[PDB]
Amino acid sequence: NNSTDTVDTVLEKNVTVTHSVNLLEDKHNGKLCKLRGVAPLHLGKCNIAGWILGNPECASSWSYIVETPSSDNGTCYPGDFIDYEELREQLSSVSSFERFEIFPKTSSWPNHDSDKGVTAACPHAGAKSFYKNLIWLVKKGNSYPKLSKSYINDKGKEVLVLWGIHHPSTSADQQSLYQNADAYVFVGSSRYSKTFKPEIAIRPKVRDREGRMNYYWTLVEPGDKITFEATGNLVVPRYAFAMERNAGSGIIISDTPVHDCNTTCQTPKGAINTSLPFQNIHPITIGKCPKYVKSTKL
Amino acid sequence: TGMVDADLKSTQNAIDEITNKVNSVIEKMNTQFTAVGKEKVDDGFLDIWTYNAELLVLLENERTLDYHDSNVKNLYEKVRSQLCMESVKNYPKYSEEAKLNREEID
Amino acid sequence: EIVLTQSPGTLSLSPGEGATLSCRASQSVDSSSLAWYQQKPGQAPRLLIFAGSSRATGIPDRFSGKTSGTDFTLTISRLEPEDFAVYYCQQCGNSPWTFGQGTKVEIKRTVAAPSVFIFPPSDEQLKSGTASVVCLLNNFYPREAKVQWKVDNALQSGNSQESVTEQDSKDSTYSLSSTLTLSKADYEKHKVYACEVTHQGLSSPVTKSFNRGEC
Amino acid sequence: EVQLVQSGAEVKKPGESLTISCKGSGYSFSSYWIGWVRRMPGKGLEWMGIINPRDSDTRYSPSFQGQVTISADKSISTAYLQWSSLKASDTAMYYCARVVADREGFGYYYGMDVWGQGTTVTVSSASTKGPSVFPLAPAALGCLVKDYFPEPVTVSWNSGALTSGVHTFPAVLQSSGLYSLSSVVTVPSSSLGTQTYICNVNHKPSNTKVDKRVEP
Ligand SMILES: *[C@@H]1O[C@H](CO)[C@@H](O)[C@H](O)[C@H]1NC(C)=O
Ligand SMILES: *[C@@H]1O[C@H](CO)[C@@H](O)[C@H](O)[C@H]1NC(C)=O
């Protein structure tokens, strides 16, 4: 009867009890330990967008993706990342990862200029660079014919394909980069289907660029073909990602450190190693985790 | 208070009923969190479940203490209904002895 | 230099007609490197079309730019009175940037014969030792005319200097002033001075003479 | 507003050193390239060069490379056309202009939009001299303006009363190196001599304001 343990009921609070068991885990380390052996993917001074597009300012296997909240390094060229939040949701659960030259810069684009598709808004070692995973396609000496490259998924895995749509500030810019004044874009997959046209307008100098680039993405199921029809403004893919999805994987946005420790349960506040069914540490959890509660103790 | 060992069948069936009631209430909360799949935004739901989880604990604790109380009275009622020591644990043998002691006292 | 040669030399159009201006380059140049400019008399140039076809900042719908091969065109639907000026083309591709020859857009009107007059030198100018004679050609069309100074049948060249006024705002007619700069020593040797005027408005190339001193 | 304000009219004898300004107003001067276009009297437009005021780099035309120096001061938002030593051939009209280019930084140039008012540069040994104004008897009557330097000469009839049928011809530089013009008016033969016809001529630089009446 020696134990001073206390339980609570609907009617009266703080009642001393002999035999009683806890349910809540309040204790944790400030460390972001590797989940079940496998190390996480930390993107310091970079966000998912920058890493996935191939921003020059910025590993295959990981347990979870870490991002510094302070990290703003993503779209070097100004624009709008379409369904970016929806892309994070899809990239939450990711085991394997193969980056491959879907449409290699060498062969794939022969009736177009691939080498002049670089800007100062996207620098790397002082040089005018661009995103490594996608080519900015411009006219091959005053002649931009209708391009129509198509990829057929042979990887067996879900293939993530990213591409851009350049919106020139002046009408003259469209006529100097693609020449075709009434240019269109089309991306056809079994699940994805959208037509694009450039929104020619002078916008504020964001990263000292008057024009903008919208960044679009889709997944291609194995066996399915993704077609790319364009007469201008398309920023074609170079590298795509054949990925194998995991279950217990997510995205942590925390400034907490990461150490060589192992953990069964991981939260942005820190790792947890408990047999308890409930936890009051943090609502975001990765792996076999005790369901979050706001309670003091249970 | 001093005892740390007592009828084994009574405590054995109590320990078993408790441990099973414990695994079931954890299950009942885990299935209730899944049931509270009714989707400041996520914080709205958060406040709901946290009280519902606390509610089940306060409710099953009320049922546990009332269950123990019911077993104590029923153990006394087993001995009281029967009326050396192992015969009570597992009246006509000592019925004649009692009348001699009841008459001399009354 | 990528020699830009504009066609025609001058455009004679009525206010309301449609202008079409050509600019043929020595070698092939980028469309986006070509531009059209309008210069009014005694005014800085104006940008009309830039990047070959793009209309400039605050230019009406009538002004349009076209290009195919080496031709390069500036087309105006309605020629407003304001539109009558000198039109230049320019390439910005291979350095140096070259400007075209320049086509003047003039108000079309009926052939006007000049009002030819001869002015004797002032007697105040005689006191200096160098006296000049002027052959005024008032209000005529087109600007295309020629004056020949005749000093006693002998046609004089070099001493003469010519000047012309732009198209008139009221009657769309040009005027010429030829000045015959001569010394007093050579002036006393001769007596009769004339100027032969040759123009489209004239039936016969008439000459107008003056006798020294005597009326 | 978006305007370029160039330097005032300049007259200097050959050999001398002259530098003419061009002030960018109401815009980011350093963003857009500034060029220079010469116009010789009775000739076509000649392109001289261009400067990116932020990069302070110059690209001269072969006809002007070495001879003239194009300077730029992004801080004062002013471009210059500095002359090492003046030639008699440098007697021309000089314009500066804001160059139109691609917003992606590729090097495509579309022409030049904002233009300066035009700097009038005279390069002659001649020196300042007033005009020897002489009348011309009439039918129209004349008014000769002979031998003067530099160029601005304003001609008006009856102190600015007679405006109809007035023809003031452009000036021409003589063999001597002095400019000379003529001024006429198509007057009717109905009131000749009876009507007082005054020919007011004024030289702004030399201040030689000679007003002579035309007598028949
Ligand atoms: C635990 O961490 C060590 C490295 O510190 C690693 O070698 C081992 O495989 C990990 N084990 C588990 C079960 O995660
Ligand atoms: C608590 O004390 C009561 C008797 O007062 C007894 O029934 C119960 O078994 C005790 N519990 C323990 C842990 O000994």
Side-chain angles (χ1 to χ4, degrees), chain C residues 16-200:
Chain C
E17 280 185 292
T20 308
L21 300 101
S22 302
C23 175
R24 274 162 218 91
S26 174
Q27 49 236 254
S28 187
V29 212
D30 199 358
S31 59
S32 47
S33 81
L34 283 161
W36 281 113
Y37 302 84
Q38 181 206 45
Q39 186 149 18
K40 278 154 175 278
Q43 277 184 48
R46 204 121 60 92
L47 183 85
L48 314 144
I49 305 296
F50 70 100
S53 59
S54 312
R55 212 188 287 123
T57 323
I59 296 298
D61 289 45
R62 54 200 193 246
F63 293 94
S64 60
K66 298 184 170 195
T67 333
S68 53
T70 349
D71 298 83
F72 190 46
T73 322
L74 192 284
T75 319
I76 314 146
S77 52
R78 288 179 184 181
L79 277 149
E80 296 291 307
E82 314 95 60
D83 299 34
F84 293 94
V86 193
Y87 285 80
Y88 287 98
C89 60
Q90 185 219 24
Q91 62 87 18
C92 309
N94 193 91
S95 194
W97 293 4
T98 47
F99 287 88
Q101 314 210 125
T103 312
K104 202 262 179 181
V105 183
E106 67 174 41
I107 308 139
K108 237 270 184 283
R109 69 150 278 152
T110 49
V111 208
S115 324
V116 183
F117 311 107
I118 188 150
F119 291 92
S122 181
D123 296 283
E124 274 85 54
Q125 191 177 40
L126 255 84
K127 211 82 189 176
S128 72
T130 300
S132 308
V133 183
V134 193
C135 180
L136 157 74
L137 268 74
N138 220 248
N139 297 126
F140 65 91
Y141 188 87
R143 197 179 201 171
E144 303 88 283
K146 185 65 194 176
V147 190
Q148 294 156 263
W149 280 101
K150 290 177 179 183
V151 174
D152 305 58
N153 189 275
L155 288 97
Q156 297 298 316
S157 189
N159 39 38
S160 60
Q161 285 164 53
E162 279 178 63
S163 189
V164 274
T165 50
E166 281 290 336
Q167 212 177 28
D168 204 272
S169 62
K170 312 171 210 181
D171 64 317
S172 305
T173 60
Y174 306 91
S175 306
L176 200 144
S177 169
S178 196
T179 314
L180 188 80
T181 53
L182 243 310
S183 61
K184 204 192 176 184
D186 295 60
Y187 197 87
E188 251 66 56
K189 283 189 177 182
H190 309 281
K191 281 97 192 176
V192 178
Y193 308 97
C195 59
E196 197 189 63
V197 171
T198 53
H199 189 253
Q200 199 188 355

Side-chain angles (χ1 to χ4, degrees), chain A residues 34-38 259-264:
Chain A
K34 302 173 186 184
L35 178 92
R36 52 190 164 180
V38 270
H259 290 77
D260 212 67
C261 47
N262 297 324
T263 194
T264 57

